[PDB]
Design a protein around this ligand. Structure first.
Ligand SMILES: *[C@@H]1O[C@H](CO)[C@@H](O[C@@H]2O[C@H](CO)[C@@H](O[C@@H]3O[C@H](CO[C@H]4O[C@H](CO)[C@@H](O)[C@H](O)[C@@H]4O)[C@@H](O)[C@H](O[C@H]4O[C@H](CO)[C@@H](O)[C@H](O)[C@@H]4O)[C@@H]3O)[C@H](O)[C@H]2NC(C)=O)[C@H](O)[C@H]1NC(C)=O
Ligand SMILES: *[C@@H]1O[C@H](CO)[C@@H](O[C@@H]2O[C@H](CO)[C@@H](O[C@@H]3O[C@H](CO[C@H]4O[C@H](CO)[C@@H](O)[C@H](O)[C@@H]4O)[C@@H](O)[C@H](O[C@H]4O[C@H](CO)[C@@H](O)[C@H](O)[C@@H]4O)[C@@H]3O)[C@H](O)[C@H]2NC(C)=O)[C@H](O)[C@H]1NC(C)=O
Ligand code: T57
Ligand code: T57
Ligand SMILES: *[C@@H]1O[C@H](CO)[C@@H](O[C@@H]2O[C@H](CO)[C@@H](O[C@@H]3O[C@H](CO)[C@@H](O)[C@H](O)[C@@H]3O)[C@H](O)[C@H]2NC(C)=O)[C@H](O)[C@H]1NC(C)=O
Ligand SMILES: *[C@@H]1O[C@H](CO)[C@@H](O[C@@H]2O[C@H](CO)[C@@H](O[C@@H]3O[C@H](CO)[C@@H](O)[C@H](O)[C@@H]3O)[C@H](O)[C@H]2NC(C)=O)[C@H](O)[C@H]1NC(C)=O
Ligand SMILES: *[C@@H]1O[C@H](CO[C@@H]2O[C@@H](C)[C@@H](O)[C@@H](O)[C@@H]2O)[C@@H](O[C@@H]2O[C@H](CO)[C@@H](O)[C@H](O)[C@H]2NC(C)=O)[C@H](O)[C@H]1NC(C)=O
Ligand SMILES: *[C@@H]1O[C@H](CO[C@@H]2O[C@@H](C)[C@@H](O)[C@@H](O)[C@@H]2O)[C@@H](O[C@@H]2O[C@H](CO)[C@@H](O)[C@H](O)[C@H]2NC(C)=O)[C@H](O)[C@H]1NC(C)=O
Ligand SMILES: *[C@@H]1O[C@H](CO)[C@@H](O[C@@H]2O[C@H](CO)[C@@H](O)[C@H](O)[C@H]2NC(C)=O)[C@H](O)[C@H]1NC(C)=O
Ligand SMILES: *[C@@H]1O[C@H](CO)[C@@H](O[C@@H]2O[C@H](CO)[C@@H](O)[C@H](O)[C@H]2NC(C)=O)[C@H](O)[C@H]1NC(C)=O
Ligand SMILES: *[C@@H]1O[C@H](CO)[C@@H](O[C@@H]2O[C@H](CO)[C@@H](O)[C@H](O)[C@H]2NC(C)=O)[C@H](O)[C@H]1NC(C)=O
Ligand SMILES: *[C@@H]1O[C@H](CO)[C@@H](O[C@@H]2O[C@H](CO)[C@@H](O)[C@H](O)[C@H]2NC(C)=O)[C@H](O)[C@H]1NC(C)=O
Ligand code: NAG
Ligand code: NAG
Ligand code: NAG
Ligand code: NAG
Ligand code: CA
Ligand code: CA
Ligand code: CL
Ligand code: CL
Ligand code: ZN
Ligand code: ZN
Ligand code: ZN
Ligand code: ZN
Lengths: 694, 694
């Protein structure tokens, strides 16, 4: 039989391993020749595997690179202008890679050039609340200072925006052992911790979903009109550079000024974590100097787009996409994901060669320039937005398949909750102590939901990956899954070797997944989800799951507002309309579910499948959220404080955030009421798409 | 048989006549009790006629009314402040209506209050080019002057915007006999000309598609958040009032200052048409004073929405809509249209009672507050935009069925050209001298197309009626048809009694259409178009007709740019990308037409019908046109100089308009190139929706 079980059994751990090894032997930085060659290899292999068509889709987008003959570095400079300490020019390469060419040295992509000199201020994680604490409570002024911030907690682009708004003239990012060194584990290559010379690369843009900084709204094709650099979207105004903890210790150890306000500001280095500004007595005359010479350059990027045409509904697309570009070797991010995509294509292709076709069209994507701001996925979605708007059933992401070896992690729209629960009950747990049990069982035991008791945790989507344009701009149901760590017992951020030269094939094979069984489980989850979305007669979305979460979010946002009962009385601020809308959605969703169960009629089916497909679409507001025209989903958006986090009822949440500090409360509360109306109206409008159509 | 011929034969001239008489015996001003009562009558009758459901959809929107105890008027005031001449407080009522209550006196809806005094400047039609002529050529400064403008040529709201931008402190609008009195015909009631005491009512907003001024983007429902009046969309900043030509003559006869620049500035009154400013020698000390006391008031309005559910595709909507609110009796505008809609409903209902249903759902609408800025249609479309976006097949408008008795007039998307040609070849001409000939034959002979020789004229759509939100905002294929005058041999504007108390049932029955045969022909055209759109197996849209017009428009916009060959060389301005896109659209459209002809498969059909339905939708840009976010169609928009006119490639056209007068040519030509790219990209994106889907 050609059923989901045939697809699943054809997937092999050994194949994922070989593909990962193949994809990680040299760097594949976006816009380089090696990543173009990798794109052409993937194109050829997907054709061999049996896809109907496989093309490259190219764009010319703004990228950023260090100058090879003018290296970036940071100094401590004395009174006489002698540079008495210098940060490293490269990470010491791992065993056996000491002769590998074209490893990009650590840098902050899209940093402007500059050589600012000044006194340091230490800003913890550079979060909105860290800057509140500095200015409002500690009375420390960042204006004209160089800020040093530890990585972790929030997207690094938000840290830079926060520093810029505080008046900083430069930012230094560093990896603290508190956040990147788990106690009792060795530094790479003897364990999976970040060594003192390790550095996290990464872009520091604030694109808010725009894609290529020069062409917001439109694909960066051959005839595209480009903004001038001064009008580009999301570029930082001050120089930024990342360092490791050996170098950070040299910069932090001399710090004077005010003590850290509390223990939450102290990392694990043997320094006091003084906030500054500047250095203690003996060293007060020394300054910090940055030297940044990176350049931004319009560069060609290449997506691979594979098509497996549906037999019955070829005009309905289920997309499996993940990126291919990496900072260096991409041992986890993204090649552990790309290897899984490759095996999934190979397996679908095996069935296709035996005469099988999915009901709906499956599109497979290898995205380029994800690391430079989701550029490849966003430009292709801008080029194809009308096809995606009217035909896009679901997007399943496929970046890093592992960030740990503890349990499953799923983040997705409520419309996929039931699909994921059902699929994971049919898959085998790969976990020790759960042999013969379902993945649902081990996942639910290890990762209980804090929102719904007895259920597994499923998180929200924000941004920081290639699902963003599909979900937040276009309103196509989206999800993602990977294996993860125990977040409850580990204090470290993400996985420690993220974006460092040490994130290699050996890291994965030796420490994370030697038998490739977690990769195989993730291939089954991602692949199974795609299979069901592309083959199930009735789309496997349950609108009732959206109703239950809308009520949780409505309760949550009301509870935030209710911290201000006097102002809600004064300005007549009522959530009644939102709760009414959510109640109506619950009622209508229930009736629609009844009809869905109670109908041989392919027009009623497809009419109903269209109602299911356009339900996520109904949460889009074509006017977008305030000052963020490419975040158009009213229920979810990436947090304005941290693009990685998904916020619910984001329009109301931002209207309420820090409201007590607004100079004109009547105007501020008016805008909260405006956002309640937009949210209530959108929830009711989405509900009505599920009503009988005539 | 229940076929189009059964539907058409059931329509009766005598029924249209009786409904028109019924709808025009009292005024039905938007927001008044009489128009609510009319709405409830129509609701009841549509149910009786056999529709499946008929509901009222109400909204609370900003309307504007004179103050009943503080009348609007204009004076000539002497030095001592004595008002020596006063304009009329009402139009003398027509025979037999001298006791009719609730006739609103002439006023400009949404005028602010004020009593400005000053010197007059005469500005011809107050068009952009009239103001260019005054400032640039004649060196006449309107700043602080009261402007007097003749009605005609462009939407009155554009005249007011132009006057405001020129610095005027008030505007007087008047009807010149040159534009509202055809030589050789008598004034009402003895003929169809405007008498000297006749005045045209009408709103002077500049909404640019927003709908209710207080709630742009969202329906004005019970919980809606409203903008404060100071933030409202489109309200004029200076007082405005309309007068007739007896009163205009008193204001114009004393005018001094500069002579009219040429004969195109002279109307037909026995005055010199001096431009001013101010009056001749003896009268130089006299001024003009306006007294405007109208108030804007949020008021409830009621649409009637009738549903005739489709038997096969109930989730595909064909909409027949026109307004019901009138300035006074609405003898032509809109009741000659509403009576035709009523007979069309009655006929569809006759077939429904015999067991027939259309393939697709037909929605019938009686819109309220059209005269106050398309408010009823726009608020309902804002409430229902997600249903309309994904299910809306076509909108057919149904305002005034006649503005003359000479030949057919059709304005519509190119996607309906072939539908209209085919339908009119099957209908009988009602014209004298064409008995036994088709409507296509008489129409083509009387109204030859200036764009395609041998074909009948079909115009573009701009705004100024209820199709605007459907076509320009949402991208749903739209069209309209009515009987019209010979435009070639008549100099007058529209029909002369437009928006006056004299536009009555008797005007229509005595002068325009005594046998109601033109109304019947229009009922057949509108009704037949709806029938075909709702019943044809394959949607009756021909994408090849769009290809031919896109090339005409591309030629046209290139020819405008080519008046500036030096600048096109200097700034490297190329239309190659647009022509390439149009060539590709032509090619793809041809192949799609082949496939459409060459496919028992309801999924291929519906897939193909979806491609046809979403083709108009593909021309929408979700970012909208510059500073007009609710005009989103890239091929057509209402002219920025005249909302009644449709402009092609409006983004490029506005970027080129008056470009030689721009201070920074590099920036201006850059924006032309930007608009070429947006247009080329959109044309190619629309083309690709017609490609094989996978
Ligand atoms: C959740 O779903 C429910 C439906 O189950 C919606 O209920 C609607 O709620 C609105 C707003 O509260 C009601 O609005 C009121 O309508 C009255 C007229 O209703 C008649 O006409 C409609 C159709 O045209 C029929 O459906 C209806 O049964 C009646 O025949 C108005 O007269 C009301 O205005 C008066 O009262 C208000 C409040 O005091 C005053 O402000 C006004 O000035 C005026 O005096 C009012 O506009 C609507 O009738 C309800 N529809 C129903 C019950 O079918 C909720 O709206 C929905 N939630 C959300 C968020 O959308
Ligand atoms: C009307 O429809 C036609 C198709 O019939 C479109 O033609 C495309 O036009 C573009 C832009 O001119 C061509 O772009 C060029 O692509 C080359 C690579 O093409 C290869 O890969 C693609 C798929 O990935 C294949 O389809 C293709 O056959 C090849 O295998 C690039 O190398 C070109 O860049 C080089 O030249 C340009 C121009 O000098 C330089 O600026 C660059 O720096 C570089 O040196 C270029 O990008 C595209 O190949 C065409 N597709 C075809 C023929 O199938 C038109 O675009 C379309 N009109 C509009 C308005 O969209
Ligand atoms: O330009 C861009 O937009 C991004 C470019 C690039 N993208 P990427 O490097 O390819 O990927 C981004 C990596 C960061 C991302 N981070 C997150 O998804 C975590 C964000 C975090 N979210 C959360 O903390 C809540 C959601 C996860 C909950 C997970 N916990 C469990 O699954 C779990 C819980 C308990 C337990 F016992 C077991 C498991 C936050 O809010 O900051 C990730 O890991 O993929 C980049 O970020 O530089
Ligand atoms: O708020 C609003 O947006 C509008 C509210 C209200 N709307 P309405 O009063 O209910 O309706 C608007 C009336 C004005 C509109 N005017 C037009 O459609 C003409 C506009 C005109 N358009 C044209 O000149 C080109 C299109 C018509 C071509 C017609 N010619 C023939 O059909 C023809 C030609 C030759 C021939 F020998 C025979 C016939 C222009 O550009 O200004 C109409 O008649 O419906 C209002 O305008 O106050
Ligand atoms: C996830 O799996 C659950 C449990 O298997 C799916 O729910 C089940 O769906 C079936 C098929 O529609 C329902 O069967 C129906 O039963 C009623 C009689 O009660 C009958 O009227 C229908 O003809 C049909 O046989 C079944 O009740 C339902 N079970 C539940 C809700 O407990 C669920 O649909 C799956 N979710 C997906 C695929 O997204
Ligand atoms: C308006 O009326 C015209 C003329 O009747 C319609 O065009 C005609 O459409 C028919 C039906 O699809 C075409 O018939 C086809 O002929 C070819 C053989 O040449 C065959 O392959 C098909 O099986 C089918 O029998 C016919 O050629 C065509 N005539 C033309 C273009 O001159 C047109 O579709 C109507 N437009 C509408 C309804 O929007
Ligand atoms: C810290 O570095 C500076 C700069 O050195 C240059 O840049 C490095 C990236 C690397 O490419 C070096 O080879 C370059 O010389 C050092 O200061 C320089 O020292 C040289 C030689 O003594 C002198 O002629 C230059 O003028 C100096 N440049 C500057 C900007 O001062 C400095 O010695 C290093 N400090 C330490 C403690 O190692
Ligand atoms: C022009 O009208 C003014 C104002 O008259 C008032 O408003 C009219 C709409 C109507 O309602 C009249 O009955 C009102 O009196 C006339 O000037 C007024 O004259 C009265 C009586 O003589 C005097 O007491 C008021 O002060 C005047 N008001 C003003 C504003 O001047 C004026 O006579 C009329 N001129 C002509 C030539 O008819
Ligand atoms: C990754 O795998 C690919 C696919 O097998 C290898 O590419 C092939 O290499 C052989 C020998 O050089 C060529 O003859 C084929 O044309 C290649 N096939 C392609 C590109 O599709 C590639 O060598 C592997 N890379 C590494 C680093 O192991
Ligand atoms: C990268 O840095 C190099 C080295 O400093 C730059 O090359 C110099 O550029 C100047 C003029 O801009 C020349 O006169 C020098 O001869 C160059 N020096 C060397 C060693 O080649 C180069 O411009 C930078 N690249 C960028 C900014 O893209
Ligand atoms: C317009 O026609 C309607 C429909 O016939 C008339 O309304 C009816 O009037 C009778 C007698 O007063 C009532 O008993 C019915 O209930 C009405 N039917 C409705 C409202 O659906 C109305 O009188 C006519 N108006 C004019 C001015 O002739
Ligand atoms: C319409 O005009 C009337 C008449 O001038 C206004 O009524 C007057 O309002 C003032 C205070 O605003 C009262 O003191 C007077 O007694 C009123 N006069 C009369 C004759 O009633 C009324 O306000 C206006 N209506 C509006 C602006 O909506
Ligand atoms: C911080 O420092 C600068 C002076 O260089 C000043 O302009 C700025 O307003 C200061 N901010 C505060 C809050 O003191
Ligand atoms: C793999 O799992 C083991 C056993 O729980 C654990 O000790 C180890 O830290 C895990 N490795 C990684 C890289 O998370
Ligand atoms: C018109 O008049 C006013 C003076 O009241 C002046 O400010 C304005 O700039 C003048 N415009 C021109 C073009 O002279
Ligand atoms: C009706 O048609 C006749 C004959 O052509 C013409 O003389 C008359 O002016 C027309 N009436 C109107 C109102 O256009
Ligand atoms: Ca872009
Ligand atoms: Ca509105
Ligand atoms: Cl992922
Ligand atoms: Cl019309
Ligand atoms: Zn990644
Ligand atoms: Zn990454
Ligand atoms: Zn009208
Ligand atoms: Zn009108």
């Amino acid at each position: 039989k050609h059923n989901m079980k045939a697809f699943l059994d054809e997937l092999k751990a050994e194949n994922i391993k070989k593909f990962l090894y193949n994809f990680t032997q040299i760097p594949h930085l976006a816009g380089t020749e090696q990543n173009f060659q990798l794109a052409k290899q993937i194109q050829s292999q997907w054709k061999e595997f049996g896809l109907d068509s496989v093309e490259l889709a190219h764009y010319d987008v703004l990228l950023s690179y260090p100058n090879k003959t003018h290296p970036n570095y940071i100094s401590i400079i004395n009174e006489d202008g002698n540079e008495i300490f210098n940060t490293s020019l490269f990470e010491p390469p791992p065993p056996g890679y000491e002769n590998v060419s074209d490893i990009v040295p650590p840098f902050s992509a899209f940093s402007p050039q500059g050589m600012p000199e000044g006194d340091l201020v230490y800003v913890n994680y550079a979060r909105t609340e860290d800057f509140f604490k500095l200015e409002r409570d500690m009375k420390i002024n960042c204006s004209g200072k160089i800020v040093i911030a530890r990585y972790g907690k929030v997207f690094r682009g938000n840290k830079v925006k926060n520093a810029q708004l505080a008046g900083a003239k430069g930012v230094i990012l560093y990896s603290d052992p508190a956040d990147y060194f788990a106690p009792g584990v060795k530094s790479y290559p003897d364990g999976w911790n970040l060594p003192g010379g390790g550095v996290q690369r990464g872009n520091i843009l604030n694109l808010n979903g725009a894609g290529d900084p020069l062409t917001p709204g439109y694909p960066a094709n051959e005839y595209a009109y480009r903004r001038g650099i001064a009008e580009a979207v999301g570029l930082p105004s001050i120089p930024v550079h990342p360092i490791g903890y050996y170098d950070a210790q040299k910069l932090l150890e001399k710090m004077g000024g005010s003590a850290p306000p509390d223990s939450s500001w102290r990392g694990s280095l043997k320094v006091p974590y003084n906030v500054g500004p500047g250095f203690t007595g003996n060293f007060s005359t020394q300054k910090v100097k940055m030297h940044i010479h990176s350049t931004n350059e319009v560069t060609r990027i290449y997506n691979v787009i594979g098509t497996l045409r549906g037999a019955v509904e070829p005009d309905r697309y289920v997309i499996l996409g993940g990126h291919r570009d990496s900072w260096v070797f991409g041992g986890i991010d993204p090649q552990s994901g790309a290897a899984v995509v490759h095996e999934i294509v190979r397996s679908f292709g095996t069935l296709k060669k035996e005469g099988w076709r999915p009901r709906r069209t499956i599109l497979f994507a290898s995205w380029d320039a994800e690391e430079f701001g989701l550029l490849g996925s966003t430009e292709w979605a801008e080029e194809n937005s009308r096809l995606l708007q009217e035909r896009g059933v679901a997007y399943i992401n496929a970046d890093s398949s592992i960030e740990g070896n503890y349990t499953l992690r799923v983040d997705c729209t409520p419309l996929m909750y039931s699909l994921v629960h059902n699929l994971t009950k049919e898959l085998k747990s790969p976990d020790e102590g759960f042999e013969g049990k379902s993945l649902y069982e081990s996942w639910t035991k290890k990762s209980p939901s804090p929102e719904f008791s007895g259920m597994p945790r499923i998180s929200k989507l924000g941004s920081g990956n290639d699902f963003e344009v599909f979900f937040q701009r276009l309103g196509i149901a989206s999800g993602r899954a990977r294996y993860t760590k125990n977040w409850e017992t580990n204090k470290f951020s993400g996985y420690p070797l993220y974006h460092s030269v040490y994130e290699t094939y050996e890291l994965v094979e030796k420490f994370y997944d030697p038998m490739f069984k977690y990769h195989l489980t993730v291939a089954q989850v991602r692949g199974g989800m795609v299979f069901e979305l592309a083959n199930s007669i009735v789309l496997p979305f349950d609108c009732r799951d959206y109703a239950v979460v809308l009520r949780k979010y409505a309760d949550k946002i009301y509870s935030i507002s209710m911290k201000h009962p006097q102002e809600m009385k004064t300005y007549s601020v009522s959530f009644d309309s939102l709760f009414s809308a959510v109640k109506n959605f619950t009622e209508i969703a229930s009736k629609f579910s009844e009809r869905l169960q109670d109908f041989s009629n392919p027009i009623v089916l497809r009419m109903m499948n269209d109602q299911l497909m356009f339900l996520e679409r109904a949460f889009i507001d074509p006017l977008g959220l305030p000052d963020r025209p490419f975040y158009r989903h009213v229920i979810y958006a990436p947090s304005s404080h941290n693009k990685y986090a998904g916020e619910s009822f984001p329009g109301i949440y931002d209207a309420l955030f820090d409201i007590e500090s607004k100079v004109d409360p009547s105007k501020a509360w008016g805008e909260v009421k405006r956002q309640i109306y937009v949210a209530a109206f959108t929830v009711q409008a989405a509900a009505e798409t599920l009503s009988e159509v005539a």
